Amino acid sequence: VHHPPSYVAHLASDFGVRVFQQVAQASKDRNVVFSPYGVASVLAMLQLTTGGETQQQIQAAMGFKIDDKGMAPALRHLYKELMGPWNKDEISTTDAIFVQRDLKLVQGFMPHFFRLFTVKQVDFSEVERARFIINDWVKTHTKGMISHLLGTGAVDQLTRLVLVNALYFNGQWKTPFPDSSTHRRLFHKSDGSTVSVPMMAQTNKFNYTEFTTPDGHYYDILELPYHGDTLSMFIAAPYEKEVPLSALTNILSAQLISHWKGNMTRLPRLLVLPKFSLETEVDLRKPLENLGMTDMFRPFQADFTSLSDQEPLHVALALQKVKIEVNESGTVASSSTAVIVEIIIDRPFLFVVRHNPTGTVLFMGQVMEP
């Protein structure tokens, strides 16, 4: 464990979880898959382009200033840790900034962006080409998983800046579920009704801890490691079907996950887990405004003087796309965030894909219906 990457990863992951809780609030009984590291990555970049109180608001919500001593080195060290070969499991994370070809950038932004995290020349008056350029780049850096990050109406002639992160993960269980154990079983939805889904089964030693909500709701917390022994998926489900999953998501944090992991012991048991493939696209405006980042969305009031004195700029929209597939052999998942300037789990559950040496939360979500 290295301190620098683990420090910034905790802040990053915690900030991401708080954004997730905001999205989960809005879609109480809907499948949500999210990427905390993903949204933290672009907003870390956004700290560089903004100024005054617009920047302050981002800094306060994230818990750190990108420009503070040792802070950027920690973020670079971080994604090096995630992408190292020793992980066995593949992670690819790439940040990018696309700027209007002829936009006059403040002197020193380019060299400052390089040594902390080069820009890519784009012509937004050429709308569809510029949208393709960016969509094509997100596509390769998600290995094809996300082909159209920016829909039609995401950029136009007036667009000047697009910050983007692309995350990819894969994704092999330390011990796979045998294909032949996969069977159909009723899943209990939040509305009481049942649906029949394919579920995976296996008997092994699983890192496990019991957990109790303030309201006394008992939860199973299970850890499913990937073969590299650095990354794992945490699964959290209520002992009884009746308990709403928000009880858990309301109290979630990066610290709690670490505290779970700190208290688990390997126990033998049969684990029945549904397979799932979730796809979510979320508008990040309200969730980000809720965490106090309101100024960046307001025309004229937003402050991007760290990027350009040439003209007033504001955030037109903020968005994230995430995909995740969980099956017998492992997990494949990717996200792209942009800013435009016997334990049977047959009820809804939480999942968290975490890199444990750093505490980085790559993906998390609630499975309301597999």
Side-chain angles (χ1 to χ4, degrees):
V1 171
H2 297 263
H3 187 80
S6 298
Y7 176 83
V8 75
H10 177 271
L11 295 184
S13 297
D14 200 45
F15 166 73
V17 172
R18 291 196 299 276
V19 176
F20 171 74
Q21 294 177 301
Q22 289 293 326
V23 182
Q25 196 104 336
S27 49
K28 177 176 169 50
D29 295 330
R30 291 296 99 112
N31 284 343
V32 181
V33 52
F34 192 72
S35 171
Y37 177 78
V39 70
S41 281
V42 282
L43 268 69
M45 269 174 134
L46 199 60
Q47 287 201 26
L48 200 73
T49 65
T50 47
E53 209 213 311
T54 295
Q55 182 192 48
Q56 198 280 341
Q57 287 169 1
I58 301 174
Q59 291 175 348
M62 299 191 67
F64 67 95
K65 309 177 194 282
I66 190 60
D67 46 289
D68 275 350
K69 201 159 100 306
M71 217 61 57
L75 274 169
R76 294 195 309 274
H77 193 309
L78 174 48
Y79 66 65
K80 286 294 154 63
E81 273 218 34
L82 296 173
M83 288 188 54
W86 59 86
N87 293 290
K88 301 301 173 58
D89 302 281
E90 173 174 24
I91 293 175
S92 178
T93 174
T94 319
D95 298 314
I97 177 181
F98 296 92
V99 296
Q100 174 64 35
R101 188 168 153 186
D102 52 59
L103 179 64
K104 298 199 171 188
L105 306 173
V106 291
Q107 193 184 30
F109 176 87
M110 290 178 296
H112 216 281
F113 173 84
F114 156 68
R115 49 164 289 273
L116 256 40
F117 298 95
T118 47
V119 302
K120 300 192 167 68
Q121 302 293 64
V122 165
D123 190 2
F124 289 110
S125 54
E126 272 275 356
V127 184
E128 279 294 76
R129 164 191 172 171
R131 191 171 68 91
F132 179 78
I133 296 298
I134 298 171
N135 278 338
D136 193 13
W137 178 94
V138 170
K139 184 171 176 183
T140 45
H141 291 95
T142 61
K143 274 157 183 283
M145 287 198 82
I146 300 172
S147 297
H148 309 295
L149 178 66
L150 307 182
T152 98
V155 288
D156 64 5
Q157 48 179 316
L158 265 54
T159 299
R160 290 295 174 272
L161 171 68
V162 175
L163 295 311
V164 61
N165 166 265
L167 179 59
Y168 178 83
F169 165 70
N170 193 29
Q172 269 204 332
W173 296 126
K174 190 182 173 61
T175 309
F177 300 81
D179 287 330
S180 54
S181 279
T182 301
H183 61 280
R184 279 190 305 247
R185 184 184 291 257
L186 284 188
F187 188 88
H188 296 253
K189 306 182 57 182
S190 62
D191 60 41
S193 79
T194 49
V195 65
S196 174
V197 286
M199 299 201 198
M200 315 182 299
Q202 71 165 303
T203 297
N204 213 340
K205 269 175 176 290
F206 287 107
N207 253 331
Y208 172 91
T209 179
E210 48 169 35
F211 175 62
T212 303
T213 277
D215 309 292
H217 305 314
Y218 194 88
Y219 277 82
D220 290 313
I221 310 297
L222 204 70
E223 194 196 14
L224 276 41
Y226 299 98
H227 78 304
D229 288 313
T230 63
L231 289 144
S232 62
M233 178 177 285
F234 290 77
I235 304 293
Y239 183 81
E240 266 140 74
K241 302 147 36 195
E242 300 78 27
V243 173
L245 186 61
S246 63
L248 180 51
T249 66
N250 279 2
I251 60 173
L252 262 184
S253 71
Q255 284 140 211
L256 182 60
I257 303 175
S258 173
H259 187 53
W260 288 345
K261 172 64 177 162
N263 274 281
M264 299 188 301
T265 56
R266 297 159 53 79
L267 295 166
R269 62 183 65 198
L270 172 68
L271 180 263
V272 177
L273 177 71
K275 49 176 47 180
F276 60 87
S277 303
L278 302 198
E279 292 160 299
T280 56
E281 169 162 19
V282 43
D283 190 326
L284 293 172
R285 168 182 273 260
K286 288 190 190 298
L288 286 175
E289 287 178 331
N290 288 350
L291 297 177
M293 285 154 290
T294 59
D295 278 26
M296 63 193 188
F297 295 100
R298 317 263 279 277
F300 299 109
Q301 189 181 303
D303 184 331
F304 281 82
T305 52
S306 275
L307 179 73
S308 199
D309 297 341
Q310 175 75 352
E311 58 171 279
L313 298 166
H314 68 277
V315 174
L317 45 93
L319 64 91
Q320 177 182 117
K321 257 210 183 68
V322 186
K323 285 184 174 55
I324 183 165
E325 175 184 7
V326 171
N327 58 13
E328 293 87 354
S329 56
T331 301
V332 60
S334 68
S335 68
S336 199
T337 79
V339 170
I340 323 289
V341 172
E342 186 192 59
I343 297 185
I344 55 171
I345 297 156
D346 57 2
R347 74 289 313 258
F349 62 95
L350 170 87
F351 68 88
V352 183
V353 181
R354 206 175 82 111
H355 178 260
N356 303 303
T358 55
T360 309
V361 180
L362 298 170
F363 297 96
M364 74 194 294
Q366 64 191 21
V367 177
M368 304 304 288
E369 178 170 11

